[PDB]
Amino acid sequence: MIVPVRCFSCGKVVGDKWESYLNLLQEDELDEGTALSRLGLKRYCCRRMILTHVDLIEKFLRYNPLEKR
Template sequence: MLFPVRCWTCGKIIGHLWDEFNERLRMAKISNDNLENGLESLFQRMGLKRFCCHTMFLSHYETYEEAIKMGFPEDYSNIT
């Protein structure tokens, strides 16, 4: 599943922040930054104040990469 463009609860546009969120988390892991204030400071720097938007980032899981590995059926004529 791709990351949603908008928060499902409040409707704020958040889709463009997904790559930034992943990059900042990756950089925090590389620098052994334990994010002392939790992820709250990260969300504040990204301009996300509502908990519903936080939930969208924390609960998202990229499944499309796993689906691509499975491949596609060779013969689509049997699919109804």
């Protein structure tokens, strides 16, 4: 669904780094690796957390029984 709060392995907050990661890939045009480094993710456990995140919430939200069309 949404970006998890804290890394499953150690507990380093990862939830504030999702939207910032896409901005480093889009606007900054950086590679996956360097973008994660600039966010402050050096442990491979914290690295995979954001890198491997799907974000199905954006797909899920497109079905809204409260708004017409």
